[PDB]
Amino acid sequence: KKRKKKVYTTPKKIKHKHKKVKLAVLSYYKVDAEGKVTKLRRECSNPTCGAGVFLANHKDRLYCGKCHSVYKVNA
Amino acid sequence: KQQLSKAAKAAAALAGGKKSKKKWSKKSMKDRAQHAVILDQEKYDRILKEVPTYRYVSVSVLVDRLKIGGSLARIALRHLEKEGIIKPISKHSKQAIYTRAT
RNA sequence: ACCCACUCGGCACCUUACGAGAAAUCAAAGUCUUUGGGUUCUGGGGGGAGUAUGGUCGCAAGGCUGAAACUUAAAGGAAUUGACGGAAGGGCACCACCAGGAGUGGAGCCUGCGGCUUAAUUUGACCAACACGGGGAAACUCACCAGGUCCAGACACAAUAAGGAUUGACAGAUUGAGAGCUCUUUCUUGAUUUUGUGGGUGGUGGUGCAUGGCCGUUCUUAGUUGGUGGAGUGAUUUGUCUGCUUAAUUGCGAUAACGAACGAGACCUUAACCUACUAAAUAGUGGUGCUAGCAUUUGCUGGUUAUCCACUUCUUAGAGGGACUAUCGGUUUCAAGCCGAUGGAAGUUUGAGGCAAUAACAGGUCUGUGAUGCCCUUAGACGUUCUGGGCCGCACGCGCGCUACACUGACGGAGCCAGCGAGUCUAACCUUGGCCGAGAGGUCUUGGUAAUCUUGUGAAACUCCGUCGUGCUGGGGAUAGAGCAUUGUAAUUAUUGCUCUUCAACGAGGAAUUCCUAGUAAGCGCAAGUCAUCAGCUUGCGUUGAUUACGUCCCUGCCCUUUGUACACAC
RNA sequence: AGCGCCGUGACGCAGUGGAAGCGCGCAGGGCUCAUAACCCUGAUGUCCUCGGAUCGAAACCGAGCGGCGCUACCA
RNA sequence: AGCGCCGUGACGCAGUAGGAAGCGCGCAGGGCUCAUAACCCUGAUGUCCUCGGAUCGAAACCGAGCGGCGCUACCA
RNA sequence: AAAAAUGAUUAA
Ligand SMILES: [K+]
Ligand SMILES: [K+]
Ligand SMILES: [K+]
Ligand SMILES: [K+]
Ligand SMILES: [Mg+2]
Ligand SMILES: [Mg+2]
Ligand SMILES: [Mg+2]
Ligand SMILES: [Mg+2]
Ligand SMILES: [Mg+2]
Ligand SMILES: [Mg+2]
Ligand SMILES: [Mg+2]
Ligand SMILES: [Mg+2]
Ligand SMILES: [Mg+2]
């Protein structure tokens, strides 16, 4: 059984790589002059989400990251 | 073996498609044979007259000697057996055997 | 003229070679490496070639004499084994024929193959391929085509590596898609990994002409081998055989062979026979012993191992018995044996199987195998999964088959009969029965882990009684239209079932060709295998049950022996 | 220069104004392991073109094309 | 010398009365085969000898050249 | 005493 070569009619698509940002201590916690701190991130309602869940921010929605939940800011 | 060319294969396929049906037999047909299934007066008189002196009486001989269908043969035969001018010998479906009375 | 004994010469024979020879063979072809009686002629691998040229003879035909160039690794002799023979002899087979039966080849359809077509229409196989791969493929299967994912890239080295090495992601483009596959902004885990170099793991990739194992075939026949001895320089041969006999290299026997082995036989399973043992509400029968329902001077059924008891005939399985061609009549190298009859259940090894030698095929299978060498491939994979399609595609050719051409029938009503099976608790299998539905089916329970229930698989062919009436007819049921259901996520390219409608070729089939000898052919169905659904297939089972022949070598082949061969890749 | 003839199936050739035939060749099936032979069956033509007469031409008429021929003597 | 002709892949042959080329060999690659040969499939190969003209358009028509074919070539 | 032709190359 002689076989041909698999010629491709489409461009190769790239496997995704995790984006490299050196901002992982900057945009999560803030320090007051006295030193008092309250996290600006919100908390997942489900108990199995974690206290340091750090709900993300989008243009129009909030993303969990662990529990994959969606909320709104003007609730 | 020897592969035929594409033109030869097409010619053979086209010849086979164009080919007529070669029936390998002599087809002989007999002519139309009709039997009066409806019993009119003249045929009934012929029945009542010549059915006696018949040595052998059956659906087939009634059909052959009289142009009546098998259905009329069966019903008329049973009618004659009711009138008793024929007596039975062997009683069976699909085959009747009858002769003269007394 | 015969006989006997001799003798010389001659044509030759038979036995054995002591001798010779490569052997076949040879009383010379002996007296030869232990080489010498005398003498003439001829040859020096095979071809070119008894040719060219010259000479000579001949009327001619031609004869005699007679090279070279060139070309080539064998040509040749005798014998051995096999193979073959339109060679002989003897046996044998229904994959041969005779006498026949049933067919097939013609028709429609089913299925497999080829070819066309195709994006692919995946592929192997050409007596001993073609309902074969257990191959009846909607997904899978799948190996093919159009695309989309994932790594299931172990391990070693090194580089990255404090938000990294890496993932997963809801929403909006996007893709057939609710695959974050790619992106659009930013969240989760955290040395589990990413990258590259070695390596390894997979592959229904290739090669069965690299191989194993298995299977088929040679080959359904009776054939096969060594120990010692004999023959031969040897390859080899005898044993292992002329005759008779058997299915048989089966025996009787003959015998430079003797004793042995495998195969055949013997052996094992299975259908038969057992009024004999063992027994059995999971097989039965009987006592009607208990009540009774019906008819009536006595039969048929219902409840019977707690509503009891007896017995194994029917049934089953344990141990056995039984047939050994027994007896008899014939026939024989009177031996192996064979032909009749009588008994017996059984007298073609009683029937049918299972197993089945040495040697081989470049037979088939790498697509059964975590059987496998080597080659190839390995991240945009020939890996593995997901969606869709294909494997089914049709001017055509072929091989298995199914249904038919009808009255020995079709249709309708009724009578009413098998054997082999199989079947759920890791979950829906075989289904009684009740109800609804024309049907296919649907619903509610029941029994069966099974001699208990489906199931007495109440099958069909069959038989009776009626309709048809020789008309391609009411035979046939192809094609096609419409609807109702079941399986399955998914039914269109129609899974299948059911109802109504359409109602084609087909009038017994040219040349040709297949299977078969008694419970066989053939007809008829049933079960099982594949199965969620799907039989026109296979493997079995029983039902009804012929004709013809107990033979021959004519055809096609097989075995043994003899023979010929310029064959051995073997006619 | 003048005159005559021929053109038909792949090939060689018949052919009566009512649509064309022999032999091979070819094709299908069979037999054979296979090919041939053999057996059983099929198919193949604006009759060189283009017009005309005829109801209808392969044939008759007119041209055009391509081949084959014949005469070519007295000087 | 005249009069007719002809020239088409590497090799032969088909055009036709102008709308761009077919076939057969050869070559190459596939299918079959242990591998070949034969066979089959596919592809490539012709600037129609060169030049010029007429034409919307020429391998087809016209002219020249080149090459080959055929016929003709005082006179008594 | 009917007829019966053929079978490409190489590969212990
Ligand atoms: K046969
Ligand atoms: K055989
Ligand atoms: K039949
Ligand atoms: K798939
Ligand atoms: Mg010599
Ligand atoms: Mg598939
Ligand atoms: Mg093999
Ligand atoms: Mg021997
Ligand atoms: Mg198939
Ligand atoms: Mg009808
Ligand atoms: Mg099958
Ligand atoms: Mg020969
Ligand atoms: Mg040969």
PDB file of C-alpha atoms (C1' of nucleotides) in Angstrom, chain D residues 3-48:
ATOM      1  C1'   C D   3     -11.366  10.040 -73.414  1.00  0.00           C
ATOM      2  C1'   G D   4     -12.886   6.025 -70.051  1.00  0.00           C
ATOM      3  C1'   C D   5     -13.365   3.648 -65.233  1.00  0.00           C
ATOM      4  C1'   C D   6     -13.478   3.224 -59.745  1.00  0.00           C
ATOM      5  C1'   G D   7     -14.904   5.049 -54.599  1.00  0.00           C
ATOM      6  C1'   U D   8     -20.018   0.496 -50.006  1.00  0.00           C
ATOM      7  C1'   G D   9     -18.856  -2.156 -42.306  1.00  0.00           C
ATOM      8  C1'   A D  10     -12.036  -2.166 -39.552  1.00  0.00           C
ATOM      9  C1'   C D  11     -10.130  -5.179 -44.454  1.00  0.00           C
ATOM     10  C1'   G D  12     -11.149  -7.460 -49.296  1.00  0.00           C
ATOM     11  C1'   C D  13     -15.453  -7.273 -52.075  1.00  0.00           C
ATOM     12  C1'   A D  14     -21.363  -8.162 -53.827  1.00  0.00           C
ATOM     13  C1'   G D  15     -25.560  -5.357 -54.727  1.00  0.00           C
ATOM     14  C1'   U D  16     -32.945  -6.083 -58.512  1.00  0.00           C
ATOM     15  C1'   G D  17     -35.114   2.937 -57.884  1.00  0.00           C
ATOM     16  C1'   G D  18     -38.601   0.324 -52.056  1.00  0.00           C
ATOM     17  C1'   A D  19     -32.945   2.123 -46.464  1.00  0.00           C
ATOM     18  C1'   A D  20     -27.210  -2.899 -47.788  1.00  0.00           C
ATOM     19  C1'   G D  21     -25.289  -7.992 -47.943  1.00  0.00           C
ATOM     20  C1'   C D  22     -20.859 -12.249 -47.831  1.00  0.00           C
ATOM     21  C1'   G D  23     -16.094 -13.870 -45.841  1.00  0.00           C
ATOM     22  C1'   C D  24     -12.873 -12.682 -42.174  1.00  0.00           C
ATOM     23  C1'   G D  25     -12.253  -8.968 -38.249  1.00  0.00           C
ATOM     24  C1'   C D  26     -14.727  -7.362 -33.504  1.00  0.00           C
ATOM     25  C1'   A D  27     -17.873  -8.167 -28.952  1.00  0.00           C
ATOM     26  C1'   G D  28     -20.503 -11.412 -24.911  1.00  0.00           C
ATOM     27  C1'   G D  29     -20.894 -16.192 -22.557  1.00  0.00           C
ATOM     28  C1'   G D  30     -18.886 -21.138 -22.383  1.00  0.00           C
ATOM     29  C1'   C D  31     -14.608 -25.116 -22.464  1.00  0.00           C
ATOM     30  C1'   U D  32      -9.077 -24.769 -20.691  1.00  0.00           C
ATOM     31  C1'   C D  33      -4.808 -23.572 -15.304  1.00  0.00           C
ATOM     32  C1'   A D  34      -4.457 -19.833 -19.357  1.00  0.00           C
ATOM     33  C1'   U D  35      -4.195 -18.431 -24.879  1.00  0.00           C
ATOM     34  C1'   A D  36      -5.551 -20.532 -29.543  1.00  0.00           C
ATOM     35  C1'   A D  37      -8.665 -23.841 -31.900  1.00  0.00           C
ATOM     36  C1'   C D  38     -13.833 -25.346 -30.690  1.00  0.00           C
ATOM     37  C1'   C D  39     -19.300 -24.547 -29.067  1.00  0.00           C
ATOM     38  C1'   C D  40     -23.513 -20.974 -28.140  1.00  0.00           C
ATOM     39  C1'   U D  41     -24.859 -16.010 -29.258  1.00  0.00           C
ATOM     40  C1'   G D  42     -24.754 -10.609 -30.829  1.00  0.00           C
ATOM     41  C1'   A D  43     -23.149  -6.034 -33.046  1.00  0.00           C
ATOM     42  C1'   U D  44     -20.697  -2.958 -37.205  1.00  0.00           C
ATOM     43  C1'   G D  45     -22.139   1.453 -42.487  1.00  0.00           C
ATOM     44  C1'   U D  46     -23.828  10.999 -44.673  1.00  0.00           C
ATOM     45  C1'   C D  47     -23.069   3.669 -49.775  1.00  0.00           C
ATOM     46  C1'   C D  48     -16.319  10.039 -51.419  1.00  0.00           C
TER      47        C D  48
END
